[PDB]
Design a binder for this molecule. Structure first.
Ligand code: HEM
Ligand SMILES: O=C(O)[C@H](Cc1ccccc1)NC(=O)[C@@H]1CCCN1C(=O)OCc1ccccc1
Ligand SMILES: N[C@H]1CCCc2ccccc21
Length: 453
């Protein structure tokens, strides 16, 4: 089997196809044209983009394939270091931190974070309750204020107070500008041109701001002796059951930077796409709003009431089906192997999983793959293995999955209990790409149902 390949630019091969603000959407269009697998070549590199459940189920075999750091992850590693997301599976600090942090992220741990999540969710509802007639909501802006504040308070008992300001925290200015520079460098065909010298100075200054501010939070907590039930305490106190070793202060810094990036870029996208799909599908909004009214019978939602929001959970999974907010992950072949009885790979060969194309595989989902239908997720047991992968694969899957879904279910539940929503501009979906996807310029009007907190 001779693999399809998209159009080429002489010595640059396929590299200029990623010279776009929307690289994942460009690759999705290539997938639609070429099918379940295509080769992508750059000077000094080759990867293969996978779109079918048939081939992705093989790529998800951990005995054959392991997590690869894509070029983007190698650039983020310059500030995220050997934190869980930018570490190789074979680095000592990956398994150590995984073993130490897994119990901090379990479904049972969510009982402990619930009160803090409610504190921030109530601030969002009170902001929207206090808007004047015909003012509107900047949805991804307010969802990012919420998710950043939530990880701040659950992560290290720190209040970013995002609802009190329009200008970001100094840590966040440097973090956003570092992420943008990392993503900007992917397309850069000539990195050493002194026209990029300024970008280079700004990056080193941003890395130094993040390192200095997180190193101070760690030193401050060690100085205070405070045992708050948060990730920083779990990381200062925890021993890996395997090595019997704790994490060192440098790695703790990288984990905090990692979790702050995740808290800014991830759940906020999911919540924005979920609200987009509800205002575009008013019958689906009615079903989710009915569930919220029937279930959330107290002014403060309980942990148990959030677990009871089955249809709200189905809405979130259907948003993740169409627009998985972390849309691609990279693997390498552990040994020589043959993919799908047709494509021979050598040890070291790279694969990319295109999660939005996986989630549109008609052999799995049927012919209506573009329709927003939460009822696809009524019965978890009816989804085949490796057909739905918004949180990645195996031991390198998302450690934050339970945290992300608990926060999103709680917040979306309270939003549907407290307000009616209007797509007052007839918003045209415009997907901005960083590491993650968000609907840029998505705005709505909310009308209070006047239910007290
Ligand atoms: C909608 C929300 C989220 C989605 C869709 C999501 C998706 C993913 C995906 C696809 C991966 C695998 C990456 C790869 O294979 O290269 C991943 C890994 C990870 N995610 Fe998330 N994530 C979300 C929220 C969060 C949150 C809230 C946190 C932390 C607060 C988090 C922390 C992580 C970490 C640390 C890893 C690396 C895990 C490891 O390799 O040990 N994520 N996530
Ligand atoms: O970063 C990469 O290597 C590739 C693009 C590429 C660049 C140069 C030659 C060949 C391919 N990246 C990707 O295909 C996707 C699309 C844009 C960024 N990206 C990616 O994987 O970002 C990192 C990431 C984000 C979210 C979750 C896991 C990993
Ligand atoms: N949740 C993952 C995937 C999305 C991007 C990202 C960034 C930092 C830390 C973790 C993650």
């Amino acid at each position: 089997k001779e693999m399809p390949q998209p159009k080429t630019f002489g010595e640059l091969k396929n590299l200029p196809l990623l010279n776009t603000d929307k690289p994942v959407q460009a690759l999705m269009k290539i997938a639609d044209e070429l099918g379940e697998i295509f080769k992508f070549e750059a000077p000094g590199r080759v990867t293969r983009y996978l779109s079918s459940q048939r081939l992705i189920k093989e790529a998800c075999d951990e005995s054959r394939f392991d997590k690869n750091l894509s070029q983007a992850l190698k650039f983020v590693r310059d500030f995220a270091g050997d934190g869980l997301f930018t570490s190789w599976t074979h680095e000592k600090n990956w398994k150590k931190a995984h073993n130490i942090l897994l119990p901090s992220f379990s479904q049972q741990a969510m009982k402990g974070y619930h009160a803090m999540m409610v504190d921030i969710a109530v601030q969002l509802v009170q902001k929207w309750e206090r808007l004047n007639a015909d003012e509107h909501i900047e949805v991804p802006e307010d969802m990012t204020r919420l998710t950043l504040d939530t990880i701040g308070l659950c992560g290290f008992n720190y209040r970013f107070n995002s609802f009190y300001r329009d200008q970001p925290h100094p840590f966040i200015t440097s973090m956003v500008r570092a992420l943008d520079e990392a993503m900007n460098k992917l397309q850069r065909a000539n990195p050493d041109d002194p026209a990029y010298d300024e970008n280079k100075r700004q990056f080193q200054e941003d890395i130094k701001v993040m390192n200095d501010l997180v190193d101070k939070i760690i030193a401050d907590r060690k100085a205070s002796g405070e045992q708050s039930d948060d990730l920083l305490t779990h990381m200062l106190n925890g021993k890996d059951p395997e090595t019997g070793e704790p994490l060192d202060d440098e790695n703790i810094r990288y984990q905090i930077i990692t979790f702050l990036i995740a808290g800014h870029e991830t759940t906020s996208g999911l919540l924005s796409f979920a609200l987009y799909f509800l205002v575009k599908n008013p019958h689906v909004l009615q079903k989710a709003a009915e569930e919220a009214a029937r279930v959330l019978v107290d002014p403060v939602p309980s942990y148990k009431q959030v677990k009871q929001l089955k249809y709200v959970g189905m809405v979130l999974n259907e948003a993740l089906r169409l627009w998985p907010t972390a849309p691609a992950f990279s693997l390498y072949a552990k040994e020589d192997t043959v993919l799908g009885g047709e494509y021979p790979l050598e040890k070291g060969d790279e694969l990319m999983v295109l999660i939005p194309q996986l989630h549109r595989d008609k052999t799995i989902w049927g012919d209506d793959v573009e329709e927003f239908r939460p009822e696809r997720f009524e019965n978890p047991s009816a989804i085949p293995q490796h057909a739905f992968k918004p949180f990645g694969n195996g031991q390198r899957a998302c450690i934050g999955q339970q945290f992300a879904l608990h926060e999103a279910t709680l917040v979306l539940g309270m939003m549907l209990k407290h307000f009616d929503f209007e797509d007052h501009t007839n918003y045209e979906l415009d997907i901005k790409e960083t590491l993650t996807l968000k609907p840029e310029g998505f705005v709505v009007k909310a009308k209070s149902k006047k239910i007290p907190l």
